[PDB]
Design a protein that fits this description.
This is part of a larger assembly, with one copy of chain A (193 residues), two copies of chain B and one copy of chain C (188 residues). With 193 residues, chain A is an alpha/beta fold. Chain A has helices at 17-20, 23-40, 66-80, 95-115, 135-149, 163-172, 185-192, and strands spanning 4-12, 44-51, 56-60, 119-127, 153-157, 176-178. Chain A has one domain. In chain A, a hairpin with a 4-residue loop joins strand 2 and strand 3 (56-60). The longest helix of chain A has 21 residues, at 95-115. The radius of gyration of chain A is 16 Å and the shape is globular. Chain B has 138 residues and is an all-alpha fold. In chain B, helix 3 (34-42) crosses helix 4 (63-77). Chain C has 188 residues and is α/β, with parallel strands linked by helices. Helix content of chain C is 43%, strand content 23%. Chain C contains six helices and six strands, in the order βαββααβαβαβα. Chain C has helices spanning 27-45, 71-84, 92-105, 129-139, 153-162, 172-183, and strands spanning 6-13, 49-57, 60-68, 113-118, 142-148, 165-169. Chain C has a six-stranded mixed sheet with strand order 3-2-1-4-5-6, with helices on both faces. In chain C, strand 4 (113-118), helix 4 and strand 5 form a beta-alpha-beta unit. In chain C, helix 1 (27-45) runs antiparallel to helix 2 (71-84) and helix 1 packs parallel to helix 6 (172-183). The chains are: A alpha/beta (193), B mainly alpha (138), C alpha/beta (188). The interface between B and D is medium-sized, with 26 and 31 residues. Chain B: This is General transcription and DNA repair factor IIH helicase subunit XPD. Chain B: ATP binds at residues 28-35. Chain B: It is found in: Nucleus; Cytoplasm, Cytoskeleton, Spindle. Chain B: Belongs to the helicase family. RAD3/XPD subfamily.
């Protein structure tokens, strides 16, 4: 508990979730995981970001805050559901944007913490989507920044093939798991990382 | 333009160890640094008295050690003058026997009664005679 | 991390000196076991890359794995080597010539690398090793040595002249630090 | 000066004058150096009486030949074995060229015998610096008085360990030298330790000094003799004081070979 820990969760919003058939359930599970994480230690913090087809957006920004976190997440995702970028209208997601947002937040939190002692942070991606060539430069830029920062990027691929994310974990020294049985999502989040 | 922290710490005491004008004994490392640090410690006195300026001589067991004294001292001076030098505007030289430096004079007068002193006397005599009126033959 | 592609030839000392109990169970067992851990971590850090495996034993060179991009062959080869152990003395010149022959073929923007784990003091080869070191530097084949308790000058020059990586290992913790240093990519 | 000289007395003894004294370098910790002695380990290890070390075959064959082979084979580094004479050197290492069929070392070492040649000397130092145990300054035998004492001015720490097989000692010829021994008895009374032992131990110290070179390097140096405690008194070897803060240069151990290999791990770590 001595070390402050920030875990940023990037959730891939892509309509691939339709293939999943449920997003609502995925949120419920992610919420349980977050609550546990916050409960483990006082010093743990969480940030949640959505990587959508069109852009990346911040869902939320402590455990006392959890009630707030739950409401903010449910509401934020619902807004996201919009028709544009529907189904595999757009196969990819804006992970590069999400990672950029995550590193900015981690940096800001770190500076404040710098006044104090060191902070440990790691980024978790729940990835539904596929990578694209156009995406390569942007994504890698963020990935390399994280590696230099020594911030591990873990990835849980529910489905699809995001090679870049796989590369991102190896690179970053993070963990990559392609989940067989997506309904076991909760176990993977708790157990896998 | 500088010198070692060690030289600065032990300069005044070393100048004092030197003041007695006759003798002294100095403790130093097993070899690396010893001779160069001497040259650095004599830089403090390179002109202690302008009206007479004393000299340094070093005594050495063998010829390969002499090139170790020359190569270190050549690095320390870098040159005879401020034009390229910055510790000592000094002039330094190696030497050893006539028996080592010169092969042809050992070879030519081959006799048992032929001392290395005598051979310089012989060479000097040929030079005086040759210069006079023997250059063509002696 | 992605940006370029690596070719690395892992060379292991299978001389009689590698049997000794100084480094866990014996040096052979501790080195192959950590080297298996390194292959999977290097291939994870370097997804587009290649490795080939060579040993020096009983005054010869032998190919434990051919040059390839699948990690599985190299961990399976390190598993299969432990049973047959180590005896005799090195053959470093013949191992740098087979490694050279594979590495010379590789294209312009990929690295050329040789990683050697060394527990000997010389090598049995007659051929002039200095001609081959000059040729490595012309070819751009970089050679690194991790030595066990040992600084014997021809090996150290050979790693410096080819690129600057002669390291000493005194524990199983220090050897994992050294291999993990080598997992690290080059600039592009 | 002579590098070390801290016990001071011998120079004023030789001069019959009292120079100004001064220590004028900053020294390094004792721990970079290690200065062992060897004599045996168990109570049955009786072959080292050295009443006639020049004639005691059993003693040459036992820890004098056998400890060298144990230390050299275990501690695999470039190591030069210094001897008190050629005759000892020839008896101790059977070599390729043996003085008898009955001699007791079998291992690859190189020789350094008389008619040394300036070009031939370098060949042996090229071999020791390049690789393997053997070369000049490497697993090679040389008499301590001989030319190997000049050393080589290589940057590379070509030397590792030196094992003095016998403590370098000298004699006093029944002529002018005997006349000198009598004179210094008349004046000092304590003549033997100053005139011969101390003067031979510096002969030792030059060869070991040439191995370890100075403050910017590391090394060890072992002595093989029955009478070795006498050598340890009066600071007649490098082991002696240079700065009180250094935390001593002690060599006592229940096993030398293990202590030097542990010390080499410590040096790689540094």
């Amino acid at each position: 508990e001595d070390e402050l820990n920030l875990l940023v969760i990037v959730v891939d919003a892509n309509p691939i979730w339709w293939g999943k058939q449920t997003l609502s359930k995925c949120i419920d599970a992610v919420m349980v995981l977050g609550n546990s994480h916050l409960f483990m230690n006082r010093s743990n913090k969480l940030a949640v970001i959505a990587s959508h087809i069109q852009e990346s957006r911040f869902l939320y920004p402590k455990y006392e805050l959890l009630t707030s976190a739950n409401e903010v997440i449910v509401e934020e995702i619902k807004d996201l559901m919009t028709k544009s970028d529907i189904k595999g209208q757009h196969t990819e997601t804006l992970l590069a944007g999400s990672l950029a947002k995550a590193l900015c937040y981690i940096h800001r939190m770190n500076k404040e913490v710098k006044d104090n002692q060191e902070m440990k942070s790691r980024i978790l991606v729940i990835k539904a989507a596929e990578d694209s060539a156009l995406q390569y430069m942007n994504f890698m830029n963020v990935i390399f920044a994280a590696q230099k920062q020594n911030i591990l990027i873990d990835a849980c691929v529910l489905d699809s093939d995001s090679g870049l994310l796989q590369q991102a974990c190896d690179i970053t020294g993070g963990l990559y798991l392609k989940v067989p049985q997506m309904p076991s999502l909760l176990q993977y989040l708790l157990w896998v990382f | 333009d500088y010198i070692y922290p060690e030289q600065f710490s032990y300069m005044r005491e070393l100048k004092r160890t030197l003041d007695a004008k006759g003798h002294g004994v100095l403790e130093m490392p097993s070899g690396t640094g010893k001779t160069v640090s001497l040259l650095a410690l004599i830089m403090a006195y390179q002109r202690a008295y302008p009206l007479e300026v004393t000299k340094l001589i070093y005594c050495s067991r063998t010829v390969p050690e002499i090139e170790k004294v020359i190569e270190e001292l050549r690095k320390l001076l870098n040159f005879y003058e401020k034009q390229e030098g910055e510790k000592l505007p000094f002039l330094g030289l190696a030497l050893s026997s006539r028996k080592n430096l010169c092969i042809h004079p050992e070879v030519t007068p081959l006799r048992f009664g032929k001392d290395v002193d005598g051979k310089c006397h012989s060479l000097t005599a040929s030079y005086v005679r040759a210069q006079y009126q023997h250059d063509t033959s002696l | 991390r992605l940006g370029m592609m690596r070719h690395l030839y892992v060379v292991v000392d299978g001389s009689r000196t590698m049997e000794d109990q100084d480094l866990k169970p014996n040096r052979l067992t501790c080195t192959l076991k950590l080297l298996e851990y390194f292959v999977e971590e290097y291939f994870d850090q370097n997804p587009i890359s290649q490795i080939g495996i060579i040993v020096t034993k009983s005054k010869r060179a032998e190919k434990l794995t051919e040059l390839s991009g699948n990690p599985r062959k190299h961990i399976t080869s390190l598993k299969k080597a432990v049973d047959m152990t180590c005896h005799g003395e090195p053959s470093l010149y013949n191992s740098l010539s087979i490694a050279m022959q594979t590495l010379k073929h590789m294209p312009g923007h990929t690295s050329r690398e040789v990683l050697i784990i060394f527990s000997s003091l010389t090598t049995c080869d007659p051929s002039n090793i200095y001609d081959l070191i000059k040729t490595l530097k012309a070819a751009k084949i970089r050679v690194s040595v991790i030595g066990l308790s040992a600084e014997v000058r021809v090996c150290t020059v050979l790693a410096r002249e080819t690129g600057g990586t002669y390291h000493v290992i005194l524990d199983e913790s220090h050897y994992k630090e050294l291999l993990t240093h080598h997992v690290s990519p080059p600039p592009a | 000066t002579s590098g070390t000289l801290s016990p001071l007395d011998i120079y004023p003894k030789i001069l019959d004058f009292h120079p100004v004294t001064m220590a004028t370098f900053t020294m390094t910790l004792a721990r970079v150096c290690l200065c062992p002695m060897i004599i045996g380990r168990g109570n049955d290890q009786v072959a080292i009486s050295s009443k006639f070390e020049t004639r005691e075959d059993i003693a040459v064959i036992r820890n004098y030949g056998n400890l060298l082979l144990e230390m050299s084979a275990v501690v695999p580094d470039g190591i030069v074995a210094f001897f008190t004479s050629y005759q000892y050197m020839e008896s101790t290492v059977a070599s390729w060229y043996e003085q008898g069929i009955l001699e007791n070392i079998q291992r690859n070492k190189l020789l350094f015998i008389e008619t040394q040649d300036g070009a031939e000397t370098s060949v042996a130092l090229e071999k020791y610096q390049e690789a393997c145990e053997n070369g000049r300054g490497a697993i090679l035998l040389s008499v301590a008085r001989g030319k190997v004492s000049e050393g080589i001015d290589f940057v590379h720490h070509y030397g590792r360990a030196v094992i003095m097989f016998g403590v370098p000692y000298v004699y006093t010829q029944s002529r002018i030298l005997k006349a000198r021994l009598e004179y210094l008895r008349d004046q000092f009374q304590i003549r033997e330790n100053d005139f011969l032992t101390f003067d031979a131990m510096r002969h030792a110290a030059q060869c070991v000094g040439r191995a370890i070179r100075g403050k910017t390097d590391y090394g060890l140096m072992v002595f093989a003799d029955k009478r070795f405690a006498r050598g340890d008194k009066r600071g007649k070897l490098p082991r002696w004081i240079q700065e009180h803060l250094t935390d001593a240069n002690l060599n006592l151990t229940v096993d030398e070979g293990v202590q030097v290999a542990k010390y080499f791990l410590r040096q790689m770590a540094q």
